[PDB]
Write a structure and sequence with these properties.
The structure is a homodimer. The first copy, chain A, is mainly β. Chain A has one domain. Helices cover about 5% and strands about 45% of the residues of chain A. Chain A is built from 1 helix and 18 strands. In chain A, the strands form 2 sheets. In chain A, strands 1, 3, 4, 5, 6, 9, 14, 15, 16 and 18 form a 10-stranded mixed beta sheet that branches. In chain A, strand 5 and strand 6 form a beta hairpin. The first copy, chain A, starts with a strand and ends with a strand. The structure holds a molecule of 3 linked components (NBG-BGC-BGC). A molecule of 3 linked components (NBG-BGC-BGC) binds next to strand 10, strand 11 and strand 12 of chain B. It is classed as hydrolase. The entry lists the keywords Inhibitor, glucanase, hydrolase.
């Protein structure tokens, strides 16, 4: 184990909490702030807690990253995450971007896990439908993305922690869920995935991906409701 | 050349015109019927024509396939297609499904070209943004999909014909647009892409892919409007 965070405390030497207004990316409904990121207890477990909350028409949630603090290359990254029910507009993600100063998507993006996509709600398997993706290109106008989407066998929103893994070498990005291979992206001649990448976790609320960008269609998070995303640990082997 | 249709006439030994109610697939707004498929002339060019039109709240368009009539395996297929401006909910596609009686998606699906996606309008490059994809898996519950999307250099909705190509061997599916390689899907160990596939062309109107499933939001086909998708030719080499 080269690195492990058990989230006994919020380590500011590793993580930064983000602050953005609604609409900052992907027509998202939440404001990100420091107050909706905490470390706490879930039973016997030390966990990072991202809390989505709604008061009136105002929506808050949490997002952290290890940019300029913790980045790695050609190593295995795993995180144990307990996801909320996403149906009706929640958008949790475990992902990485290039640890350099290049504007997105030139920095590179690996989406290890996201749930909450529009089509999953329409098909009635929002609890099983996972997206994994890579984004790259020298600019936004030249943005390129590869996706794989599938239902896993059983609910990942089942009140349990699940293991999300990326295996990374010169040739391949291999995503696994509870130690079962989900998909492999070929990067052997992709120039954007051979540098240091930092880690992100967030719980977005609505946005293009969920197909919900009007608070009137946000059934997934109600007035007075708080909803948590729990990360028990993250490690780099 | 194994096969070439110049569309001097509609050959019922190769092609079948499809009839479906609105919302048959993907929450699409259009009815498909035989009256909205024709063969005719675009100047000197003999063309297959798929016509989308709106009479009040009734939307009609055209869809054809060569199931049980014309299918192939490990051949290059190209088509020369002129597209309408898709912005505001039009959804043209050139694609393939396995020539067997397995229920979708166990038949396999190759989407060589589709345009008109939500994100294309949101990225203000609706004339340039193309999706390519493969769908497979034993049931609708176990639906798996790989997709690539990017903007091509030049408008594909510019009043001219463009060439859409699939190269297909036992290892690779390679989509090209105007002889520029767009994406390669690895099918080397994917069991769903090693039998005969038939061809489809269609012009859907609205649907989940467009993010417009409500006729009130459909700005791309107004009341009293008529739009044409033109295929000059298709060939298998
Ligand atoms: C690339 C992309 O985003 N979408 C795919 O492209 C094509 C062309 O744009 C879409 O039309 C596909 O939609 C899927 O097509 C299947 C075959 O037409 C549909 O399957 C059919 O479903 C009906 C109703 O349930 C059944 O009665 C038919 O037997 C079955 O073939 C499927 O529902 C639809 O999602 C995209 O895959």
């Amino acid at each position: 184990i080269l690195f492990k965070d058990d989230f006994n405390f919020f380590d500011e030497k590793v993580w930064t909490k983000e602050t953005h207004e609604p609409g900052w990316t992907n027509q998202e409904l939440q404001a990100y702030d420091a107050a909706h990121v905490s470390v706490g207890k879930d039973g016997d477990k030390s966990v990072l807690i991202l809390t989505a909350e709604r008061k009136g028409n105002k929506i808050y949630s949490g997002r952290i990253n290890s940019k300029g603090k913790k980045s790695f290359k050609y190593r295995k990254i795993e995180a144990s995450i307990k996801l909320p029910k996403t149906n009706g507009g929640l958008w949790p993600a475990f992902w990485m971007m290039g640890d350099n100063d290049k504007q997105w998507p030139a920095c590179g993006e690996i989406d290890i896990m996201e749930m909450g996509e529009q089509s999953g709600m329409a098909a009635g398997d929002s609890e099983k439908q996972v997206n994994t993706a890579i984004h790259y290109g020298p600019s936004a106008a030249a943005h390129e993305q590869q996706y794989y989407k599938a239902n896993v066998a059983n609910s990942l929103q089942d009140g349990n922690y699940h293991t999300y893994s990326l295996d990374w070498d010169e040739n391949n990005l291999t995503i696994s869920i509870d130690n079962v291979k989900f998909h492999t992206f070929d990067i052997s001649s992709n120039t954007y995935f051979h540098d240091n990448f930092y880690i992100l976790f967030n719980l977005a609320v609505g946005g293009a991906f969920t197909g919900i960008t009007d608070i009137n269609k946000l059934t997934g998070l109600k007035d007075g409701q708080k909803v948590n995303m729990y990360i028990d640990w993250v490690k780099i082997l």
